[PDB]
Amino acid sequence: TPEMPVLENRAAQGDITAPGGARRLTGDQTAALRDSLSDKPAKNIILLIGDGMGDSEITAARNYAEGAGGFFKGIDALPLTGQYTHYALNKKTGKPDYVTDSAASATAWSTGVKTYNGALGVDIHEKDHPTILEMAKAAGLATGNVSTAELQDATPAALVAHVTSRKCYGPSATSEKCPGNALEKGGKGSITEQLLNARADVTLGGGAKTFAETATAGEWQGKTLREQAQARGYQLVSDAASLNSVTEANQQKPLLGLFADGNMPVRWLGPKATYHGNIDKPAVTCTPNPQRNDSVPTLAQMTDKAIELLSKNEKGFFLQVEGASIDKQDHAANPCGQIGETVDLDEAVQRALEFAKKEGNTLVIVTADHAHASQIVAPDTKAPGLTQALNTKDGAVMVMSYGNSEEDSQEHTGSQLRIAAYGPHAANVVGLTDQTDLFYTMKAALGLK
Amino acid sequence: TPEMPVLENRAAQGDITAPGGARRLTGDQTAALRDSLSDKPAKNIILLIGDGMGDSEITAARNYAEGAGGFFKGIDALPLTGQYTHYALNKKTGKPDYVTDSAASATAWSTGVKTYNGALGVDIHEKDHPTILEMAKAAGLATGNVSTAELQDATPAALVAHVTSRKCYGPSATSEKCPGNALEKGGKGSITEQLLNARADVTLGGGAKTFAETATAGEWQGKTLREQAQARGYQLVSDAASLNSVTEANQQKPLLGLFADGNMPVRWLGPKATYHGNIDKPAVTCTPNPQRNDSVPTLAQMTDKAIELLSKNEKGFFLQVEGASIDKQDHAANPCGQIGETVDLDEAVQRALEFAKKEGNTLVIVTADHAHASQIVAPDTKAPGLTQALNTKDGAVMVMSYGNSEEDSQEHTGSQLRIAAYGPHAANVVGLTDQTDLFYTMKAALGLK
Numbered sequence: 016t017p018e019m020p021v022l023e024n025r026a027a028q029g030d031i032t033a034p035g036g037a038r039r040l041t042g043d044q045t046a047a048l049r050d051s052l053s054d055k056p057a058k059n060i061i062l063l064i065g066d067g068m069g070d071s072e073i074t075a076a077r078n079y080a081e082g083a084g085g086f087f088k089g090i091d092a093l094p095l096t097g098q099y100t101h102y103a104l105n106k107k108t109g110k111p112d113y114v115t116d117s118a119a120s121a122t123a124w125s126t127g128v129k130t131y132n133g134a135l136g137v138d139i140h141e142k143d144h145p146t147i148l149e150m151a152k153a154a155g156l157a158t159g160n161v162s163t164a165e166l167q168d169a170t171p172a173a174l175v176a177h178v179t180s181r182k183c184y185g186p187s188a189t190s191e192k193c194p195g196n197a198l199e200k201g202g203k204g205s206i207t208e209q210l211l212n213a214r215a216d217v218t219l220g221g222g223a224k225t226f227a228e229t230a231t232a233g234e235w236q237g238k239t240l241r242e243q244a245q246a247r248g249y250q251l252v253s254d255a256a257s258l259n260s261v262t263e264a265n266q267q268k269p270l271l272g273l274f275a276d277g278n279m280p281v282r283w284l285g286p287k288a289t290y291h292g293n294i295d296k297p298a299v300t301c302t303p304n305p306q307r308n309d310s311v312p313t314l315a316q317m318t319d320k321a322i323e324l325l326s327k328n329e330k331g332f333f334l335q336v337e338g339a340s341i342d343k344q345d346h347a348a349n350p351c352g353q354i355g356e357t358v359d360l361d362e363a364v365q366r367a368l369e370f371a372k373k374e375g376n377t378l379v380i381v382t383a384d385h386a387h388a389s390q391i392v393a394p395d396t397k398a399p400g401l402t403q404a405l406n407t408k409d410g411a412v413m414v415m416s417y418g419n420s421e422e423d424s425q426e427h428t429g430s431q432l433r434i435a436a437y438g439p440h441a442a443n444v445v446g447l448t449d450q451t452d453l454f455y456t457m458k459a460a461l462g463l464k
Numbered sequence: 465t466p467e468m469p470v471l472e473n474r475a476a477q478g479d480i481t482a483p484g485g486a487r488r489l490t491g492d493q494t495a496a497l498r499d500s501l502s503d504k505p506a507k508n509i510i511l512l513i514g515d516g517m518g519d520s521e522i523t524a525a526r527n528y529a530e531g532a533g534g535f536f537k538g539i540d541a542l543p544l545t546g547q548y549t550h551y552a553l554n555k556k557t558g559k560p561d562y563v564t565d566s567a568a569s570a571t572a573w574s575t576g577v578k579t580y581n582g583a584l585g586v587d588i589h590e591k592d593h594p595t596i597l598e599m600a601k602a603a604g605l606a607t608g609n610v611s612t613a614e615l616q617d618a619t620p621a622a623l624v625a626h627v628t629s630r631k632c633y634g635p636s637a638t639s640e641k642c643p644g645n646a647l648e649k650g651g652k653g654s655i656t657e658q659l660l661n662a663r664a665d666v667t668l669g670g671g672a673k674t675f676a677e678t679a680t681a682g683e684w685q686g687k688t689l690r691e692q693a694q695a696r697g698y699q700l701v702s703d704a705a706s707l708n709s710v711t712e713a714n715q716q717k718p719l720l721g722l723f724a725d726g727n728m729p730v731r732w733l734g735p736k737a738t739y740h741g742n743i744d745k746p747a748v749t750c751t752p753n754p755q756r757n758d759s760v761p762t763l764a765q766m767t768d769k770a771i772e773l774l775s776k777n778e779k780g781f782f783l784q785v786e787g788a789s790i791d792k793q794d795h796a797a798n799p800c801g802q803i804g805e806t807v808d809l810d811e812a813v814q815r816a817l818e819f820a821k822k823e824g825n826t827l828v829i830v831t832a833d834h835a836h837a838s839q840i841v842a843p844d845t846k847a848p849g850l851t852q853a854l855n856t857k858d859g860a861v862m863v864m865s866y867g868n869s870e871e872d873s874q875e876h877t878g879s880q881l882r883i884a885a886y887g888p889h890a891a892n893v894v895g896l897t898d899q900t901d902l903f904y905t906m907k908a909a910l911g912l913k
C-alpha cells in the first residue's frame with residue numbers, strides 16, 4: 016500500500032507544439048500534496064547528494080538524456096520541493112563566504128553548524144561537532160556511507176571525520192597539513208583513520224590508494240590502513256561480485272568496499288569543452304565509457320545493496336549516497352562526464368524511492384551541496400569561456416558553457432538550489448530553508464536526542 | 465484569521481557561527497503546509513514576474529540587500545514552491561530550443577502553448593491563441609497589466625497582442641516586420657494597436673514613445689495612438705499624482721498610464737562589470753538613482769493602485785505585474801541595477817501578499833520567464849568574462865560574474881527555476897512543472913471557459 020505517492024509521470028503529456036501538449040500536469044494536485052504530508056516519525060532516512068548538481072545541472076542532464084519535455088523518474092519524481100542556501104563562513108571574520116566548497120557544505124548538513132571552506136566536522140574555532148551519522152549509530156541505527164568518489168573526499172568524509180583541512184587524507188598529508196589532528200601528535204587521526212574508527216555498518220566507494228599508507232602511531236603503528244581494517248574486523252570487498260556476495264553487515268562485521276584506487280570510473284565519455292567549441296567543432300554525442308565495467312558496481316547497485324544490508328536492522332537506518340562526479344566533471348568542463356553522472360544518480364534515486372514507497376516510513380532527500388559553473392546557452396553563442404554543442408535525445412542541439420574561470424578548473428557558484436524530498440517529515444524542505452536546517456530536519460525525523 | 469499563512473520568518477535564527485544559528489525554520493512545517501492547501505476557487509489572481517529572475521538572481525539580491533542569512537519579506541515568503549521548465553521551440557522543426565526569449569516564455573504562460581523565440585500570442589504555425597487576460601475579460605473579470613518596461617515589451621505585450629515578431633511595436637515597425645499583422649494588410653495590428661483593442665481595465669508602464677505613432681488604417685487613421693486612446697475613452701495618466709487621482713477604472717473608463725517614454729527608471733546605479741573587476745577595482749556599494757523621481761510611481765505603488773481599482777470588481781480580477789529591469793540590467797552586466805530591480809519587485813510582492821492575506825481568495829504567484837547569466841563566484845576568481853565585487857549588508861564582499869557572451873549583451877540561460885505561490889490552487893506549482901502548466905493552473909483556478 017503506497018500511502019504516500021511519488022510523482023509517477025511529469026513528462027510533457029503530449030505534442031509539445033500543440034495547446035496543452037507541453038503540460039506536465041493532468042489535473043489539480045491539491046489532494047495529492049495533502050496526501051504527501053505526514054508528520055509521523057521516519058524509521059529510515061536516505062540522503063542522496065549530487066555534488067554540484069544545481070538546477071542548471073539537472074536541466075542540462077534532462078534535456079540531453081530525456082529531452083526538454085522528458086522526466087527523470089528518480090530526480091524529478093519527488094513531490095515536495097524547495098530551494099536552500101549553502102553559504103559558508105570566513106574563518107577569520109565569521110561573516111558569510113558566499114561560495115562554499117564541498118567540505119563546508121557537507122559539514123553543514125551533517126552537523127548543523129556553518130563553517131569555513133576546507134573544514135570537515137569542525138566549526139570556525141576548529142571544534143568538533145558530532146555528525147548525523149555518529150548520532151544515528153549512537154542511537155542504535157544502522158549506518159551507511161556511499162560515494163563514487165574516493166572515500167576520503169569531502170562528501171563522504173564529512174560524516175565520519177573531523178579535520179581542519181579536507182586535504183588530510185591519510186597519515187602523510189595529515190602530519191603536514193593537519194598537525195593538530197595527527198595521530199603521532201596526539202590527534203584523532205587522518206580522515207581515513209577516523210573513518211575506520213567511526214565504523215559505519217556499510218561504507219562503499221573509491222580511494223583505496225590511501226589505504227596503502229602506514230599508521231604513524233597507536234595500536235596499529237607500522238601497518239597499512241588496509242591491514243588495520245582487516246585487523247579491526249571489517250569485511251573488505253573490491254569488485255561487484257564480492258559486494259554481491261555479502262549477506263550481513265553490522266558492527267561485528269562492518270562492510271568496507273574499495274572499488275577503485277581513486278574515484279570510480281565515470282559513466283560516459285566525451286571531449287572537453289573548448290573556446291568557441293560550439294562554433295568550430297561539430298556536435299557531440301556522449302558514449303558509454305568502456306572502463307566503466309561489469310566488475311565495478313554502479314551507484315544504483317551500491318545503493319540497492321546498502322539498503323538491503325541496512326534494512327535488516329530493526330530500529331532503522333541512516334544512509335547517504337553520493338553522485339560525486341557531477342561536480343568533478345563540471346570542474347573539468349566535460350559535459351558528457353557531467354550529465355552521465357547525473358543520469359547515474361537518477362538511477363540510484365529510483366532505487367531509493369522504490370524502497371521508500373514500499374516501506375512507508377522512509378524519508379528520501381535529493382539535493383546538492385552547492386551550485387556549479389555549467390550553463391545552458393543559445394546555440395550560436397560566442398562566449399569567452401569553454402563551450403560544447405551536444406546532440407540531445409530530442410535530436411536538437413544544446414550548447415553548454417563554462418566561463419567562470421580562466422584558471423584550469425571551473426568554479427562553484429553561490430546560487431540557492433533545489434532540495435526535494437518524499438516521505439514523513441518531507442514538508443520541511445518546502446520553501447526557502449538553509450543547508451543547516453537539513454541536519455535538524457533529519458535529527459527530528461529520526462527522533463534523535 | 466488568514467487561514468492561509470505566509471512564511472513570516474525565514475531569516476537565520478541567530479548567530480550564524482554557532483550550531484543551529486543559521487537555521488531558517490523554527491519548527492516542523494507539516495501542519496502549516498496542510499493549512500496552506502485549498503482547492504477552493506480563486507476569485508483573484510496576481511502574477512508577478514521578475515524578468516530573468518532565476519535562483520541566482522534572487523540569491524545575489526538577497527545576499528546584497530538582506531545578507532546571506534536574510535529573507536525577502538515578499539519574494540521568499542511564499543510557502544509553496546517548485547521548479548519549472550521554460551524551453552521554447554525551433555520554428556522550423558518544432559523541436560525544443562533550450563533557451564527561450566522573453567516573448568516565447570510570456571506566450572507560454574499567457575496562452576498554454578509553446579512557441580518560437582520572438583513570437584507573441586501565436587504558436588509555431590503563426591496562429592493566434594487566446595490569452596489569460598482576454599479570457600478573464602470575456603468572463604466578466606477585471607483585468608490589469610503592469611510593468612516597468614515599455615508596455616510594448618514582450619512581457620506585458622503577450623497578454624494583449626498576437627504578432628509574429630516582438631519587434632512589431634507600432635504601425636511603422638509592424639508594416640515592416642509583421643506585414644501579415646499590419647492593420648493595412650488586414651491584420652489585427654501592431655502591438656500597441658492591439659493593446660488598445662484588448663482594453664484592459666488598468667494598464668500601467670512605460671512606452672509612451674510608440675504612442676506618438678500614427679495609425680495607417682482603421683477608424684482612427686491619421687490620428688496618433690495617443691489620440692486614438694483618449695478617443696476610445698481611455699483615462700490617460702502620466703504621473704504619480706495623476707495616477708493617485710484615479711478613483712475608478714473599468715470597461716467604461718479604462719486606465720492607461722504612460723510613466724515614461726521608454727522603460728521606467730532603475731532604482732539603483734552602479735558601474736558596469738569589467739574584465740577582472742573583482743581584482744583590479746574596489747568593491748562597489750550601489751547608489752540610489754537620483755533621477756528615478758518622486759513624480760514616477762514605483763512598481764509597488766502601481767501595484768497597490770491596480771489592486772484597489774481592480775478589486776472594486778465583484779466578479780474578481782486577474783493581474784500581471786512585471787519587474788522588467790532585472791533582465792535588462794542582467795544583459796548590461798550591471799549588478800547594481802539588476803539587484804535594485806529585484807528589491808523593487810520584492811516590495812511589489814509584499815503588497816500583493818498583504819492584500820491576499822486579507823482577501824482570502826487570492827492566488828498569488830511569483831516567478832520569472834527564464835534564467836539569466838549572472839553567477840555568484842568566489843572573491844579571488846580570475847574569470848574570462850565580466851566581474852564585479854560588491855559590499856553586502858553582511859559587510860563582506862560578494863563577486864558577480866557575467867561570462868556567457870563576448871558580445872555587448874549577456875545572454876539568457878536555460879536552467880529550470882523557482883516558481884512560488886500562495887493561496888487557493890497553489891499546490892499546482894509544487895514539484896516540477898512546465899511554464900505552460902501555469903496557464904492551465906490560472907485558468908482552472910478562476911474557472912474560465
Ligand SMILES: [Mg+2]
Nearest residue numbers: 066117170339
Ligand atoms: Mg563530493
Ligand SMILES: [Mg+2]
Nearest residue numbers: 515566619788
Ligand atoms: Mg520582460
Ligand SMILES: [Zn+2]
Nearest residue numbers: 066067117384
Ligand atoms: Zn561539492
Ligand SMILES: [Zn+2]
Nearest residue numbers: 067117342427
Ligand atoms: Zn567542486
Ligand SMILES: [Zn+2]
Nearest residue numbers: 515516566833
Ligand atoms: Zn525575459
Ligand SMILES: [Zn+2]
Nearest residue numbers: 566791795876
Ligand atoms: Zn532578456
